[PDB]
Design a protein around this motif. Structure first.
Motif, PDB file in Angstrom:
ATOM      1  N   UNK A  75       0.859  -1.285  -0.037  1.00 58.41           N
ATOM      2  CA  UNK A  75      -0.003   0.055  -0.092  1.00 58.41           C
ATOM      3  C   UNK A  75       0.828   1.210  -0.037  1.00 58.41           C
ATOM      4  N   UNK A  76       2.097   1.361   0.668  1.00 58.36           N
ATOM      5  CA  UNK A  76       2.866   2.481   0.537  1.00 58.36           C
ATOM      6  C   UNK A  76       3.346   2.608  -0.839  1.00 58.36           C
ATOM      7  N   UNK A  77       3.976   1.454  -1.366  1.00 56.03           N
ATOM      8  CA  UNK A  77       4.575   1.296  -2.597  1.00 56.03           C
ATOM      9  C   UNK A  77       3.832   1.925  -4.058  1.00 56.03           C
ATOM     10  N   UNK A  78       2.451   1.306  -4.056  1.00 54.70           N
ATOM     11  CA  UNK A  78       1.435   1.649  -4.936  1.00 54.70           C
ATOM     12  C   UNK A  78       0.199   2.328  -4.435  1.00 54.70           C
ATOM     13  N   UNK A  79      -0.687   1.597  -3.545  1.00 53.47           N
ATOM     14  CA  UNK A  79      -1.753   1.998  -3.064  1.00 53.47           C
ATOM     15  C   UNK A  79      -2.776   1.034  -2.830  1.00 53.47           C
ATOM     16  N   UNK A  80      -3.949   1.412  -2.539  1.00 54.77           N
ATOM     17  CA  UNK A  80      -5.129   0.621  -2.309  1.00 54.77           C
ATOM     18  C   UNK A  80      -6.448   1.156  -2.824  1.00 54.77           C
ATOM     19  N   UNK A  81      -7.194   0.200  -3.429  1.00 53.54           N
ATOM     20  CA  UNK A  81      -8.600   0.502  -3.844  1.00 53.54           C
ATOM     21  C   UNK A  81      -9.706   0.485  -2.589  1.00 53.54           C
ATOM     22  N   UNK A  82     -10.637   1.260  -2.844  1.00 51.66           N
ATOM     23  CA  UNK A  82     -11.950   1.236  -1.949  1.00 51.66           C
ATOM     24  C   UNK A  82     -12.389  -0.426  -2.041  1.00 51.66           C
ATOM     25  N   UNK A  83     -12.904  -0.803  -1.010  1.00 54.81           N
ATOM     26  CA  UNK A  83     -13.359  -2.216  -0.895  1.00 54.81           C
ATOM     27  C   UNK A  83     -14.652  -2.325  -1.959  1.00 54.81           C
ATOM     28  N   UNK A  84     -15.459  -1.456  -2.050  1.00 52.11           N
ATOM     29  CA  UNK A  84     -16.628  -1.693  -3.197  1.00 52.11           C
ATOM     30  C   UNK A  84     -15.674  -1.723  -4.398  1.00 52.11           C
ATOM     31  N   UNK A  85     -14.693  -0.955  -4.753  1.00 52.22           N
ATOM     32  CA  UNK A  85     -14.025  -1.083  -6.194  1.00 52.22           C
ATOM     33  C   UNK A  85     -13.473  -2.272  -6.386  1.00 52.22           C
TER      34      UNK A  85
END
Ligand SMILES: *C(C(=O)O)[C@H](O)C(=O)N[C@@H](CC(C)C)C(=O)NCCCCNC(N)=[NH2+]
Length: 212
Positions: A75-85
């Motif tokens: 998550x720090x290197x790229x990121x994270x999506x919303x759970x809905x997504x």
């Protein structure tokens, strides 16, 4: 730091989830800490995708287990999506981060709590929810219904969960076994016993995300 912390009471904890049969606890634990730090830093409580970490953390082993620190590093290197997504499917699939548009949140790093140190973990929890591990295989833990849990349990940690608070004689844990387990999905685990492993090995391996 104060006598009591409960991040639910400060609106930093989303509803309790159920990982199902999939060994995805490492991703749920990581996600709890991300939801918490995003609320703390931005004021908004959102749910983020355990499934994305399950599919995309190449250092982890999908439903065969994994590493909270690796998911947080992802998550720090790229990121994270919303759970809905990117909803939870209970099975590892191909990594679909690229096909789901821009990330919803991103952190700036991952820092480990000094292991085997109760005060260090309490300090961390005072600043944010923390990913922790414990031994959950024992029947006493499996059947926990409520109260301050003292065991019996060993220190052979096998289950990642999230510490979201504490009190004078316990640490407050968000589990990923649904809302029908424990205290509406939570367990309070005794602290202050002088055992450096922590009850059920609770101090073995603790990580939290960093977000500036
Ligand atoms: C979580 C669960 O369902 O209880 C799951 O079993 C898990 O994440 N297990 C971890 C141990 C804790 C996170 C400390 C685990 O086994 N991690 C090591 C990697 C997975 C095992 N090795 C392989 N090759 N699959």
């Amino acid at each position: 730091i104060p006598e009591y912390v409960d991040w639910r009471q400060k609106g930093a904890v989303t509803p309790v989830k159920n990982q199902g049969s999939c060994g995805s606890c490492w991703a749920f634990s990581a996600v709890v800490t991300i939801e918490g730090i995003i609320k703390i830093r931005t004021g908004n409580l959102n749910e983020y995708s355990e499934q994305e970490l399950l599919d995309c953390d190449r250092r982890s082993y999908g439903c065969n287990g994994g590493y909270p620190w690796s998911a947080l590093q992802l998550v720090a290197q790229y990121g994270i999506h919303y759970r809905n997504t990117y909803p939870y499917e209970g099975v590892q699939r191909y990594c679909r981060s690229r096909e789901k548009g821009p990330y919803a949140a991103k952190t700036d790093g991952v820092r480990q709590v000094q292991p085997y140190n109760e005060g260090a973990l309490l300090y961390s929890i005072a600043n944010q929810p923390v990913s922790v591990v414990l031994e959950a295989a024992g029947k006493d833990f499996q059947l926990y219904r409520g109260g301050i849990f003292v065991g019996p349990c060993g220190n052979k940690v096998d289950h990642a969960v999230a510490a979201v608070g504490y009190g004078p004689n316990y640490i407050l844990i968000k589990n990923s076994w649904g809302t029908g387990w424990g205290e509406n999905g939570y367990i309070r685990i005794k602290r202050g016993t002088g055992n450096s492993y922590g009850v059920c090995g609770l101090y073995t391996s603790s990580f939290y995300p960093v977000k500036n």
